[PDB]
Amino acid sequence: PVYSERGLKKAVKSDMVSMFKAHLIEHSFFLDKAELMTRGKQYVLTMLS
Amino acid sequence: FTEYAGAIKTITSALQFGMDALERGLVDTVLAVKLRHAPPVFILKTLGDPVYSERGLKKAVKSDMVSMFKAHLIEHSFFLDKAELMTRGKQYVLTMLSDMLAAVCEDTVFKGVSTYTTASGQQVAGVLETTDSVMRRLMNLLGQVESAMSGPAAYASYVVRGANLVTAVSYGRAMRNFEQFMARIVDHPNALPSVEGDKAALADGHDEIQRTRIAASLVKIGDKFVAIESLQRMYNETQFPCPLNR
Amino acid sequence: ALDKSIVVNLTSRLFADELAALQSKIGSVLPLGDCHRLQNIQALGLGCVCSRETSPDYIQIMQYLSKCTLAVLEEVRPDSLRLTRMDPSDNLQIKNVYAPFFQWDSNTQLAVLPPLFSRKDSTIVLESNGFDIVFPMVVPQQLGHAILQQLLVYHIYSKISAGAPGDVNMAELDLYTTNVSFMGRTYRLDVDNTDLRVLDDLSMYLCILSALVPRGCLRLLTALVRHDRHPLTEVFEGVVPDEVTRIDLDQLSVPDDITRMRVMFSYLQSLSSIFNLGPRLHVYAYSAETLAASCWYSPR
Amino acid sequence: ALDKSIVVNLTSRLFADELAALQSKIGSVLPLGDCHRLQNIQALGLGCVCSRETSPDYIQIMQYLSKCTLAVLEEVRPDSLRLTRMDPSDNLQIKNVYAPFFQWDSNTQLAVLPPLFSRKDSTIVLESNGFDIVFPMVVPQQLGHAILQQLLVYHIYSKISALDLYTTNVSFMGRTYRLDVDNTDPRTALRVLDDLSMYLCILSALVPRGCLRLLTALVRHDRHPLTEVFEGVVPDEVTRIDLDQLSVPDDITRMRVMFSYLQSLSSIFNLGPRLHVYAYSAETLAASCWYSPR
Amino acid sequence: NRGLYTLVNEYSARLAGAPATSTTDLQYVVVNGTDVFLDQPCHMLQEAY
Amino acid sequence: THEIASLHTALGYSSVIAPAHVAAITTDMGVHCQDLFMIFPGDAYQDRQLHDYIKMKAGENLPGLSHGQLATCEII
Amino acid sequence: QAENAARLGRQVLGLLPPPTHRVSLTRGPEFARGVRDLLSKYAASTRPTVGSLHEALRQAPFRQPTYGDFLVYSQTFSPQEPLGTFLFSFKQEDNGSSMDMLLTPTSLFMLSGMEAAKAPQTHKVAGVWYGSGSGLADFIPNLSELMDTGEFHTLLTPVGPMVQSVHSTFVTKVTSAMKGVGLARDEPRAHVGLTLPCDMLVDLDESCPMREPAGLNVTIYASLVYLRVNQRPSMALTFFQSGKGFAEVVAMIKDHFTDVIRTKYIQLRHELYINRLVFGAVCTLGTVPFDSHPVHQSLNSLPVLVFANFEAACGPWTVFL
Amino acid sequence: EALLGVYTNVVEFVKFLETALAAACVNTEFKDLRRMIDGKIQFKISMPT
């Protein structure tokens, strides 16, 4: 609720779309990304919690 | 009958709404008083160290402080976000939040007064506040050892009864505890102020308040016990913006 | 919750003859100079402003009526009259006794006008106190904005015939002014041309406008040329007569013209309000056999 | 029944300087924007439309004044201003502290006007909060008109110049005064003049001929106290229109239309909301009146 | 220009001159001080990054 | 209604705020520049035929924006 | 059966005007205890309840309107109405014992005869409540001559909204409202508001904002404009909703009717009749309280606005130009 | 068709005194606060050398 606390203006929706891109590229197939990281199990847990 | 008694339910629920929209007014304005008197870390931190103010605020000492307002903002701002990308991690937050803790001037007249206490008689130092996103961060990094505190159950009274009303009507002033103030001058003179005797007069009726059982979160930081409260539930159930989000 | 009653006491008892004239109009609308309940006689008529010894006025009465409080008779007891108070937006009842008799219908707008007719129709002389009470001329608004107009035209041509005989025909003047048509009916008013000093002030003002207005509006057109001229004023150049546009404004100097333009506007707002706004009230029900009209008063 | 009270929160403690002027005017009328109990100080002033760096236009300021509700002060505490409200139609006490002083009595009539004589006297600035407060002026209805009569004449004769004793001085029995014109925006004061060119040349078209012939019989020999405007000489225009013969039923249609357009000149010479005072105390300077609706 | 102890007290409670709007399409200046919570550390330090 | 008297007991500073966690950038850091034609519309060139030409070569107009709330730049 | 009569003992003695405050002086200062509605600040507690404030709600202001009872031909007043329309009492001469003529603004659109494009919505609706326009023109034969010299705005007295109408075959009874809020007859404890067709109303205050002050008051104005179409005289009635005060709206109505002033007065370069110079009039239909939302409706379609809490206060007709 | 339930929120009020925010404050019930104009607290600080 920290994002849409002002009401869905035209400035909020573009911030909410630009985070749709940056989360789909970075964190997708997260169990496949965790097979090669140094941390590993922390990346699955902080994704699933 | 069920139209009548279905109408008395509406007007109470319109009027319980009346009082409980005013109790949010307390939690708004008290938090609004704090933020008017709350300078940030990077301004207040180097003023916390007395080692620069020993020589006085000369022309050169003001200039040397300015470079430390600059350098502290570039590095240590957003301190919880840098902690995920550092190898050190959990120690870096614990030092920086405790370095916030020792920078606060705790000089209070009511410091000897018995007030909000933990279990086993240990003493609450102060209360930090976060949002909901930061509250779960600090709850993971720091244990919540007690999750219980004692405190006052009701307020304390102050009435203008007695000889206060004589000076209120005739003159224009109202003395704080005139009966406590009268005996010091004319009845018991020439006594130096002794702290263990002044404290009963300094308590101002905050002693003899009935203690109670208050449910809240606690945390242990160094020698000081801090309580943690995130106020978005009282703001996002009413769909107003929060003043903690800046 | 609020109580309202206006009780006027007197010094001497009334005659037996004067009581029947006040019982003739047991319902009426009197003006009243004070709001308090106990009051002396000298305010409840128009004798406080209009009298026989003073010159008869129109405008100083019309200044007075909008400033004055209205009141309605309930019971006449010797010697203590009993009026009832008028409130802003209050419903009460009126009997319509005014000489001469104009017909009231429901859903008309009552307009209080000063009496400009003969004396015995308007007033009832109280011989015991030696003071004159004067009942106002209550006339419906569309008549009241027309019964004044044909008489005010008649007063002008009376001033022309007294100065020069050849310009005004009496038969042309009488037949077109003293006969008033309204609601399909006619009313032949009392002229009282036996010697109309009431309307002499309005006959002065409207004429002084009529010479200064076409002198006034020429200078006010030419002084307002802009790129931001309001576009409706281009149309109204066709409305002004062609003879008006041919004034040489060089003849009057600048110190004369400031005196004219301040005289120009100062009559206009003093003359507009005395036609427009007086104590004016509405009536929603009427009955001809009972002669009682339920009313409600709207101030301003 | 009904309550009326506006208490004004204020974010800084007022100085002893500015509190002494506010303690001086404890009975005063100032308009404000909204209808609530709590209110910011940025609505209390009339100076949201009349600021210093903005060139004021006193017609538009007076046009502003009929919109707003009006309010009377009760107390001046050193933090919060406290006011009472005026609603049509309600009886209330009013007390004139207003500096270009005039005398009232029982059964008088009033109006509310913008400050047109001394702005620096009738406005106090608040250096503690940075926002200034502008007080309007209450005037009896005769001078309520007669000041607006001069200001409409003034914008006529400042445009022709594209001197001051005739244009800037409002006359009254016993006193003469000075209007405050240094920076005036004429564009809202000229649209009123734009409608005056509409009404006045229509009234020059339907002129009664007999009422023109009355002045040709009057001002040449019959001299009266209120006809000294013409100074004894007829205008040249009036001899030109009177060549036609007189007839009654021409003027009967004309004088009704002359009557009906003077109903319209109320709408262009309007004041603000009016105040019909019934009882006025002299030595106390208090009064009692009912607020009229717009 | 005044003492810095006064500037610390004036830093939090006084939203200083020329601020920028939020959540609206372009950079406007905000004149309505009822809501906006911005804290700008660019006046006291007199820098630009 | 309800009225509050709130004082400050401590001589020194008793409350400390801090930046904690970055959430979003709304500025979008866009390279749009501020147009001085909008700030100072009264000042213009002497030939009004030529001032309508340079205004043609520079330029509510945006119905949508993708990356975020756009931010103005200057020129010194 | 007297239990039914005991109901009228309750309701009539419960519903009265409040009596005059008159206490004899020998009783003492008891009269200060008889003043309750002037007290306007009631005490509150930690948990207030209705039983703490049932005395607080008991004092209420004194509001009772004054109704109008009209006996109308069933031909002029169309038999189905949305029960909140605005009215007019046209009056020429008392010819009958008691027969009255009432004009809804849909009906006055039919006597007007203006073009369809000026009001593109109500022309279909007002064409099916009536005939082609001669069903109502038979009662006023002077509708050609009442428009020329300009007496039509002097013959209308604005009445207000409807309350009740009992309809028969030949004679229709109409119960109208003046002075304020008319009590609804069929639904108990309800209040009839004023309804206007969306086509006839013209709002005045509308901004981007690109600030205007608030108030307690906004005043609906009626308007009526004499014009000429097809070289035939005809009228045009529009409404206004504004809280600008009377000194502004007369200048604002001139900007709305700019084209109507211009297209008429092209004609009088040739013929200048002083009877033709009168143009329009503006009445005051009473106040509306601030920030009440006008709610759109739909009837048969016909969109119709509604104004809750309407109060009526009729005014004169003043001739603007 | 059928009604399956009427489900309604209940606003649990939160007292200021039972928040843990109130440890940062000192709370005194003061009866007549409209009567007071100004409050005032006086400090006396001795400084030895």
Task: Evaluate whether chains F and H are touching (3 or more beta carbon pairs less than 8 Å apart).
Answer: yes
Contact D63, G247 (CB under 8 A): yes
Minimum CA–CA partner of H38 in chain D:
D78
Contact G137, G149 (CB under 8 A): no
Question: Of B30, B110, B206, which has the smallest distance from its Cβ to H16's Cβ?
Answer: B30
CA end-to-end span of chain H, whole Å? 89
CB neighbours of B181 closer than 8 A, spacing ≥ 6?
A: B175
| Inter-chain CB pairs, E–F, below 8 Å | 17
Strand, coil or helix: G41: coil
Minimum CA–CA partner of C275 in chain G:
G318
Helices D187-203 and D141-159, packing angle to 10 deg: 100
Beta strands across the sheet bearing B217-221 = B124-130, B224-230, B217-221
Contact D44, D32 (CB under 8 A): yes
Question: Of B30, B159, B228, which has the smallest distance from its Cβ to H31's Cβ?
Answer: B159
Interface mutation vs chain B, best among F1, F4, F9, F15, most B CBs within 10 Å: F15
Separation between Cα atoms, residue C240 and residue G268, nearest integer Å: 11
Which of D91, D109, D79, D86 is closest to D31 using CA atoms? D86
Cβ <8 Å between G268 and C238: yes
G-chain CB neighbours of C109 within 8 Å are 157, 316
> By the CB < 8 Å criterion, does B149 face chain H?
yes
At position E34, the amino acid (one-letter code) is: T
Contact G197, G117 (CB under 8 A): no
Q: What beta strand segments (E) does chain D contain? A: 6-8, 29-32, 69-76, 81-85, 91-95, 108-113, 123-124, 133-134, 137-140, 169-171, 176-178, 275-280, 286-291
- Exposure string of D182-194, with b = 16+ CB inside 10 Å and e = fewer, is eebeeeebbbbbb
Question: Of H23, H27, H31, which has the smallest distance from its Cβ to B227's Cβ?
Answer: H23
Torsion sign across C-alpha atoms C215, C219, C222, C228: negative
> By the CB < 8 Å criterion, does G41 face chain D?
yes
**Angle (CA) D73 D77 D80, round 5°:** 80
Query: At G53, which helix (H) or strand (E)?
Result: helix G50-53
Cβ <8 Å between D270 and G251: no
Minimum CA–CA partner of B9 in chain G:
G50
CA end-to-end span of chain D, whole Å? 23
CB neighbours of D286 closer than 8 A, spacing ≥ 6?
A: D27, D93, D94, D95, D280
Q: How far is CA D172 from CA D141, D142, D180, D275, in A?
A: 12, 9, 17, 21
Which tokens sit at D118? 């001394």
Separation between Cα atoms, residue D244 and residue D210, nearest integer Å: 10
Phi and psi at residue B81, to the nearest 5°: -80, -35
Minimum CA–CA partner of E21 in chain A:
A11
Separation between Cα atoms, residue D64 and residue G248, nearest integer Å: 10
Count how many Cα atoms sit within 13 Å of the Cα of residue C227 in the half-sphere of its side chain.
0
Query: At D23, which helix (H) or strand (E)?
Result: helix D16-24
DSSP secondary structure of D125-190: --TTTS--EE--EEEEHHHHHHHHHHHHHHHHHHHTT--HHHHSEEE-SS-EEE---SS--THHHH
Which tokens sit at A47? 């994704």
Residues 16-35 of F with CB under 8 A from A: 23-24, 26, 28
Contact A3, F24 (CB under 8 A): yes
DSSP secondary structure of G133-173: SHHHHTT-TTTTHHHHTT-GGGSEEEEEEEEE--B-SSEEE
CB neighbours of D238 closer than 8 A, spacing ≥ 6?
A: C211, D212, D215, D216
Residues 33-52 of F with CB under 8 A from A: none
Torsion sign across C-alpha atoms C29, C32, C35, C40: negative
Separation between Cα atoms, residue C27 and residue C24, nearest integer Å: 9
D-chain CB neighbours of G320 within 8 Å are 264, 267
Separation between Cα atoms, residue H41 and residue C180, nearest integer Å: 85
Contact C60, C148 (CB under 8 A): no
Cβ <8 Å between H34 and F3: yes
Cβ <8 Å between A2 and B131: yes
CB atoms inside a 10 Å sphere around CB G52: 14
Question: Of C35, C172, C243, which has the smallest distance from its Cβ to D248's Cβ?
Answer: C172
E-chain CB neighbours of B70 within 8 Å are 45, 47
F-chain CB neighbours of B108 within 8 Å are 9-10, 14
> For tokens 């009349």, what's the residue?
D50
Which tokens sit at D237? 């225009």
Question: Of F17, F34, F69, which has the smallest distance from its Cβ to E25's Cβ?
Answer: F69
CA distance A30 to chain E (A): 33
Which tokens sit at G210? 């690109």
Separation between Cα atoms, residue B198 and residue B196, nearest integer Å: 6
Which of C233, C241, C47, C251 is closest to C129 using CA atoms? C47
Strand, coil or helix: D21: helix
Separation between Cα atoms, residue D63 and residue D69, nearest integer Å: 13
Which tokens sit at B210? 């009935």
C128 burial via Cβ count (<10 Å: 0-12, 13-18, 19+): middle
Q: What is the gyration radius of the CA atoms in chain E, in angstroms? A: 12
> By the CB < 8 Å criterion, does F1 face chain H?
no
> By the CB < 8 Å criterion, does D253 face chain G?
yes
Give the resolution to one decimal, in Å: 4.3
Name the interface residues of A facing E (CB cutoff 8 Å): 6, 9-12
Q: How was this structure determined?
A: cryo-EM
Minimum CA–CA partner of E35 in chain A:
A6
Q: Are strands D176-178 and D169-171 parallel, antiparallel or unpaired?
A: antiparallel
G-chain CB neighbours of B12 within 8 Å are 49-50
> By the CB < 8 Å criterion, does F5 face chain H?
yes
Which of G273, C153, C264, C208 is closest to D210 using CA atoms? C153
E42 burial via Cβ count (<10 Å: 0-12, 13-18, 19+): exposed
Question: Of B35, B47, B73, which has the smallest distance from its Cβ to E12's Cβ?
Answer: B35
At position D20, the amino acid (one-letter code) is: A
Cβ <8 Å between D255 and C149: yes
Which of C236, H48, H13, C214 is closest to G279 using CA atoms? C236
CB atoms inside a 10 Å sphere around CB G9: 10
Separation between Cα atoms, residue G85 and residue B38, nearest integer Å: 61
Interface mutation vs chain B, best among H10, H27, H31, H46, most B CBs within 10 Å: H27
Cβ <8 Å between G262 and C282: no
**Angle (CA) B79 B84 B86, round 5°:** 85
Contact C191, D196 (CB under 8 A): no
Count how many Cα atoms sit within 13 Å of the Cα of residue E9 in the half-sphere of its side chain.
9
In the beta sheet, which residues pair with residue C186? Answer: C181
Q: What is the 3-state secondary structure (H, E, C) of A2-49?
A: CCCCCCCCHHHHHHHHHHHHHHHHHCCCHHHHCCCCCCCHHHHHHHHC
Which chains does E contact via 3+ CB–CB distances below 8 A?
A: A, B, F
H-chain CB neighbours of B228 within 8 Å are 20
Count how many Cα atoms sit within 13 Å of the Cα of residue D82 in the half-sphere of its side chain.
8
Contact D179, D116 (CB under 8 A): yes
Strand, coil or helix: D109: strand
C-chain CB neighbours of D202 within 8 Å are 236, 239
Task: Evaluate whether chains C and H are touching (3 or more beta carbon pairs less than 8 Å apart).
Answer: no
Separation between Cα atoms, residue B21 and residue B27, nearest integer Å: 11
Which tokens sit at D5? 């009270």
Task: Evaluate whether chains A and F are touching (3 or more beta carbon pairs less than 8 Å apart).
Answer: yes
At position C138, the amino acid (one-letter code) is: V
CA distance G46 to chain B (A): 8
CA distance B211 to chain G (A): 21
Q: Are strands G191-192 and G182-183 parallel, antiparallel or unpaired?
A: antiparallel
In the beta sheet, which residues pair with residue B123? Answer: B117
> For tokens 């108070």, what's the residue?
C85
Separation between Cα atoms, residue B105 and residue B160, nearest integer Å: 33
> By the CB < 8 Å criterion, does D197 face chain C?
yes
Please name the residue ranges forming H helices in C68-186.
Answer: 119-122, 141-144, 147-161, 170-177
G-chain CB neighbours of B15 within 8 Å are 48-50, 53
Separation between Cα atoms, residue G182 and residue G191, nearest integer Å: 6
G-chain CB neighbours of C105 within 8 Å are 91, 94
| Inter-chain CB pairs, F–H, below 8 Å | 13
CB neighbours of A18 closer than 8 A, spacing ≥ 6?
A: F66, F67, F68
Separation between Cα atoms, residue D260 and residue C149, nearest integer Å: 11
CB atoms inside a 10 Å sphere around CB D205: 20
